[PDB]
Write a protein that binds this ligand. Structure first.
Ligand SMILES: [Mg+2]
Ligand SMILES: [Mg+2]
Lengths: 96, 48, 27, 69, 49
RNA sequence: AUAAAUUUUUAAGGUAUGUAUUUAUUUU
RNA sequence: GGAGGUCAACAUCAAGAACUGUGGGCCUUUGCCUAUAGAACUUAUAACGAACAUGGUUCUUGCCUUUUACCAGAAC
């Protein structure tokens, strides 16, 4: 589901934005994803981030008709230097 | 334009725009994404 | 060549708007 | 001391005063210019506007039938 | 480029200018059944003619 | 056989607030 | 009298592709037709500036506890 992934990216960005304005800043350089993702122990918030991903973007026009299949990705959230981050969906076995 | 003429009028010394020409032309190829994105900003300001 | 893939704009959408070709699916 | 008012302020009280001369923004000139005009189916047991108001309206009852739920 | 909300590949991007494109009837005219995909129609065409 | 990159900051919203602090003698 | 001025004042600078004056004829001064003269400056990938800022109001968004301050598109 496209729009849900869309909402994930938004929502999570919005929360991090909360902690950010909690000080005063949206500046990205101040908050490298360490800050938000290190487990509580190491002194991070430990928030479990499945925003990141890359989000299948293919050519809406026809995707109102055919189901054209993924041709492209749109960067969900970002970094500055990247690394990556593991996302929940990958640690949960699917129902089937 | 500046050159081929040989007769013309003066201009307020801050109107001569030395870097406009660079960012109208293409970015070339080698430059790292930093500068390219700098170009696109300079256009967007121009077109507007 | 924005071909219809991508966004109306990343102003509200929290992403950077970056779009890249998908290596996987071609045939 | 919270009281319902019984009155309003005469503009005249203002009118006597001397001016100030502060300059607002919305007074800066704009529009300086005027413009002038020239078998099976038998089995079952059951054998064969605008009302001036709100809370009695049909819309409002739809609405309250959605949201407050 | 702006007014159509398109982007020349090296180009400046702007806002929609006619933002609501999303209204659409489900209507047979330009449908797929009845169209031939032979050459893709990149943007630059749409900015060129 | 891909070259597609959003942001970035300042004020406002134990205590505020209020009160008195006349010294140097105005004619019988 | 000539040349000049980092001198001044007073006019004029965006439109039927477009200026002004004058003569003759008609309606009755405007105006219309015709004849005639002169036309600086600015214009066709359109314009006084082979340049480029801010503000107001009204809408659509984005930041999103609220007002300044703002995000990016439009109209006046
Ligand atoms: Mg208070
Ligand atoms: Mg208040």
């Amino acid at each position: 589901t496209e729009p849900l992934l869309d909402i994930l990216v938004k929502g999570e960005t919005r929360i991090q934005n909360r902690v950010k304005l909690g000080l005063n800043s949206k500046m990205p350089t101040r908050f490298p994803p360490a800050v938000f993702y290190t487990p509580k122990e190491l002194g991070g918030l430990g928030m479990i981030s499945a925003s990141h991903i890359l989000i299948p973007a293919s050519d809406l026009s026809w995707s109102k008709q055919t189901d054209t299949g993924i041709t492209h990705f749109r960067a969900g959230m970002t970094h500055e230097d990247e690394k990556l981050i593991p996302t929940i969906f990958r640690y949960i076995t699917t129902w089937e | 334009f500046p050159f081929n003429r040989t007769k013309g009028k003066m201009v307020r010394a801050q109107d001569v725009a030395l870097a406009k020409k660079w960012f109208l032309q293409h970015p070339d190829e080698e430059y790292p994404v930093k500068v390219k994105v700098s170009y696109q900003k300079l256009l967007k300001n121009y077109v507007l | 060549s924005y071909n219809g893939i991508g966004l109306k704009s990343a102003k509200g959408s929290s992403t950077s708007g970056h779009v890249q070709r998908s290596l996987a699916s071609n045939n | 001391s919270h009281r319902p008012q019984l009155e309003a302020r005469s503009g005249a009280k203002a009118a006597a005063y001397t001016p100030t001369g502060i300059e607002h923004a919305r007074l800066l000139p704009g529009h300086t210019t005027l413009k002038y005009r020239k078998s099976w189916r038998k089995g079952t047991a059951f054998g064969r506007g605008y009302i001036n108001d709100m809370t009695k309206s049909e819309y409002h009852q739809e609405f309250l039938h959605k949201h407050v739920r | 480029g702006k007014a159509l909300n398109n982007a020349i590949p090296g180009g400046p991007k702007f806002e929609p200018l006619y933002p609501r494109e999303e209204e659409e009837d489900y209507n047979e005219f330009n449908s797929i059944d009845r169209v031939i995909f032979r050459v893709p129609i990149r943007s630059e065409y749409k900015v060129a003619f």
